[PDB]
Amino acid sequence: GKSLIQQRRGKGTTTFRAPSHRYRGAVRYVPLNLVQERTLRGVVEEILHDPGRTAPVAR
């Protein structure tokens, strides 16, 4: 037989791959090995639209 769309997606071709070079970087907190017991303080300086996220991000 011939192949299904769900089987062609596993190959990893351009027709199926996400365009993440368009996005703002990943979102992660701060590593424990650098926030062990310090209680860091920060200021919000920008709020931005992110194309890969469904939620707005802040800088």
Cβ(18)–Cβ(52) under 8 Å? yes
d(CA 27, CA 35): 17
| 6 scored as a contact of RNA (CB under 7 A) | no
- Region of 7-15, 41-49, 51-59 interacting with RNA (CB under 7 A): 7-15
Mark residues 17-46: x for contact with RNA by CB under 7 A, - for none: --------------xxx-------------
How many residues are present in the chain?
A: 59
Per DSSP, the three-state class of 27 is coil
Binding site for RNA (CB under 7 A): 1-3, 5, 7-8, 11, 13-15, 31-33
